[PDB]
Design an enzyme around this catalytic site. Sequence first.
Site, PDB file in Angstrom:
ATOM      1  CD  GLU A  67      -3.256  -0.248   0.045  1.00 51.97           C
ATOM      2  OE1 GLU A  67      -3.098   0.601  -0.821  1.00 51.97           O
ATOM      3  OE2 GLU A  67      -4.333  -0.888   0.105  1.00 51.97           O
ATOM      4  CG  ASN A  78      -8.232   7.361  -4.850  1.00 55.02           C
ATOM      5  OD1 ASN A  78      -8.242   7.461  -3.614  1.00 55.02           O
ATOM      6  ND2 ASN A  78      -7.483   6.470  -5.491  1.00 55.02           N
ATOM      7  CG  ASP A 102     -13.412   8.995  -5.519  1.00 58.63           C
ATOM      8  OD1 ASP A 102     -12.172   8.993  -5.418  1.00 58.63           O
ATOM      9  OD2 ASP A 102     -14.158   8.528  -4.624  1.00 58.63           O
ATOM     10  CB  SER A 108     -11.447  10.080  -1.815  1.00 60.01           C
ATOM     11  OG  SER A 108     -11.005   8.942  -2.529  1.00 60.01           O
ATOM     12  CG  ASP A 120      -6.269   5.868  -1.125  1.00 59.79           C
ATOM     13  OD1 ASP A 120      -7.456   5.893  -0.792  1.00 59.79           O
ATOM     14  OD2 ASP A 120      -5.896   5.391  -2.218  1.00 59.79           O
ATOM     15  CG  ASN A 152     -10.931   6.513   0.106  1.00 56.14           C
ATOM     16  OD1 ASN A 152     -12.090   6.948   0.134  1.00 56.14           O
ATOM     17  ND2 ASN A 152     -10.096   6.654  -0.917  1.00 56.14           N
TER      18      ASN A 152
HETATM   19  C1  LIG Z   1      -9.102   0.409   3.697  1.00 56.81           C
HETATM   20  C2  LIG Z   1      -9.845   2.126   2.869  1.00 56.81           C
HETATM   21  O1  LIG Z   1      -9.821   3.320   2.984  1.00 56.81           O
HETATM   22  N1  LIG Z   1     -10.525   1.397   1.976  1.00 56.81           N
HETATM   23  C3  LIG Z   1     -11.765   1.919   1.403  1.00 56.81           C
HETATM   24  C4  LIG Z   1     -11.417   2.545  -0.064  1.00 56.81           C
HETATM   25  O2  LIG Z   1     -10.094   2.446  -0.479  1.00 56.81           O
HETATM   26  C5  LIG Z   1      -9.554   2.449  -1.744  1.00 56.81           C
HETATM   27  C6  LIG Z   1      -8.230   2.940  -1.866  1.00 56.81           C
HETATM   28  C7  LIG Z   1      -7.364   3.066  -2.991  1.00 56.81           C
HETATM   29  C8  LIG Z   1      -8.092   2.600  -4.207  1.00 56.81           C
HETATM   30  C9  LIG Z   1      -7.306   2.692  -5.449  1.00 56.81           C
HETATM   31  C10 LIG Z   1      -5.897   3.238  -5.383  1.00 56.81           C
HETATM   32  C11 LIG Z   1      -7.961   2.246  -6.627  1.00 56.81           C
HETATM   33  C12 LIG Z   1      -9.267   1.712  -6.854  1.00 56.81           C
HETATM   34  O3  LIG Z   1      -9.757   1.364  -7.882  1.00 56.81           O
HETATM   35  O4  LIG Z   1     -10.020   1.630  -5.615  1.00 56.81           O
HETATM   36  C13 LIG Z   1      -9.680   2.007  -4.127  1.00 56.81           C
HETATM   37  C14 LIG Z   1     -10.382   1.952  -2.808  1.00 56.81           C
HETATM   38  O5  LIG Z   1     -12.471   2.440  -1.019  1.00 56.81           O
HETATM   39  C15 LIG Z   1     -13.393   1.353  -0.944  1.00 56.81           C
HETATM   40  C16 LIG Z   1     -14.562   1.747  -1.880  1.00 56.81           C
HETATM   41  O6  LIG Z   1     -15.503   0.689  -2.065  1.00 56.81           O
HETATM   42  C17 LIG Z   1     -13.953   1.220   0.498  1.00 56.81           C
HETATM   43  O7  LIG Z   1     -14.924   0.185   0.728  1.00 56.81           O
HETATM   44  C18 LIG Z   1     -16.200   0.748   0.928  1.00 56.81           C
HETATM   45  O8  LIG Z   1     -16.217   1.315   2.286  1.00 56.81           O
HETATM   46  C19 LIG Z   1     -17.194   1.469   3.364  1.00 56.81           C
HETATM   47  C20 LIG Z   1     -16.738   0.838   4.659  1.00 56.81           C
HETATM   48  O9  LIG Z   1     -17.449  -0.320   5.084  1.00 56.81           O
HETATM   49  C21 LIG Z   1     -18.524   0.845   2.875  1.00 56.81           C
HETATM   50  O10 LIG Z   1     -19.638   1.320   3.667  1.00 56.81           O
HETATM   51  C22 LIG Z   1     -20.162   0.329   4.530  1.00 56.81           C
HETATM   52  O11 LIG Z   1     -20.856  -0.722   3.879  1.00 56.81           O
HETATM   53  C23 LIG Z   1     -21.196  -1.836   4.736  1.00 56.81           C
HETATM   54  C24 LIG Z   1     -21.965  -2.853   3.877  1.00 56.81           C
HETATM   55  O12 LIG Z   1     -21.097  -3.968   3.646  1.00 56.81           O
HETATM   56  C25 LIG Z   1     -22.019  -1.468   5.975  1.00 56.81           C
HETATM   57  O13 LIG Z   1     -21.884  -2.543   6.942  1.00 56.81           O
HETATM   58  C26 LIG Z   1     -21.884  -0.132   6.665  1.00 56.81           C
HETATM   59  O14 LIG Z   1     -23.122   0.557   6.798  1.00 56.81           O
HETATM   60  C27 LIG Z   1     -20.998   0.797   5.729  1.00 56.81           C
HETATM   61  N2  LIG Z   1     -20.565   2.016   6.318  1.00 56.81           N
HETATM   62  C28 LIG Z   1     -19.988   2.159   7.509  1.00 56.81           C
HETATM   63  C29 LIG Z   1     -19.921   3.545   8.139  1.00 56.81           C
HETATM   64  O15 LIG Z   1     -19.507   1.266   8.195  1.00 56.81           O
HETATM   65  C30 LIG Z   1     -18.628   0.277   1.464  1.00 56.81           C
HETATM   66  O16 LIG Z   1     -19.639  -0.738   1.516  1.00 56.81           O
HETATM   67  C31 LIG Z   1     -17.311  -0.308   0.926  1.00 56.81           C
HETATM   68  N3  LIG Z   1     -17.537  -0.487  -0.527  1.00 56.81           N
HETATM   69  C32 LIG Z   1     -17.743  -1.631  -1.198  1.00 56.81           C
HETATM   70  C33 LIG Z   1     -18.821  -1.571  -2.306  1.00 56.81           C
HETATM   71  O17 LIG Z   1     -17.026  -2.590  -0.844  1.00 56.81           O
HETATM   72  C34 LIG Z   1     -12.825   0.680   1.447  1.00 56.81           C
HETATM   73  O18 LIG Z   1     -13.401   0.852   2.751  1.00 56.81           O
END
Ligand SMILES: CC(=O)N[C@H]1[C@@H](Oc2ccc3c(C)cc(=O)oc3c2)O[C@H](CO)[C@@H](O[C@@H]2O[C@H](CO)[C@@H](O[C@@H]3O[C@H](CO)[C@@H](O)[C@H](O)[C@H]3NC(C)=O)[C@H](O)[C@H]2NC(C)=O)[C@@H]1O
Length: 129
Positions: free
Chosen positions: A35, A46, A48, A50, A52, A59
Amino acid sequence: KVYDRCELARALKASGMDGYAGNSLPNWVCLSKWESSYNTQATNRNTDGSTDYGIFQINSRYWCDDGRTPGAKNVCGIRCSQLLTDDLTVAIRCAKRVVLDPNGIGAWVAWRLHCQNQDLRSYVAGCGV
Ligand SMILES: CC(=O)N[C@H]1[C@@H](Oc2ccc3c(C)cc(=O)oc3c2)O[C@H](CO)[C@@H](O[C@@H]2O[C@H](CO)[C@@H](O[C@@H]3O[C@H](CO)[C@@H](O)[C@H](O)[C@H]3NC(C)=O)[C@H](O)[C@H]2NC(C)=O)[C@@H]1O
């Protein structure tokens, strides 16, 4: 600070990251390596709007506030700037909160791509942990 692989391993073991939510130590070293290359000051913007932040590349759309991300939730309740310090206390605490969501360690794209279903034995080898 750019952490030495074993220096990081010892710091994560000490913070209770080994087995945190069923994720052994080598998983966390493997994701920090890919990472950020163990650099706490790593940032990546990113498409959008945002960004990292830090060693775990957290994120700004869901976990921290950086004041320039549209429709952000700041679930960790911190400034993103706090994730770039040489001191890992805040990064660890937020990362701990990130793996409690349903997707777990799968939240990290680098983990799914280079660590998942691999032998990670080498990431802790020689660390004496
Ligand atoms: C470790 C960090 O920062 N990672 C987050 C982030 O990070 C990245 C970082 C770098 C990249 C790069 C370089 C390229 C690329 O293509 O994508 C990326 C995504 O982007 C993801 C986008 O999907 C987030 O995942 C999304 O993040 C939140 C955290 O859980 C979600 O919301 C949550 O969804 C779940 C449903 O499963 C619930 O339980 C909760 O209500 C909810 N929110 C909360 C507040 O917890 C959502 O679903 C989930 N997306 C998917 C579609 O996987 C993940 O967290």
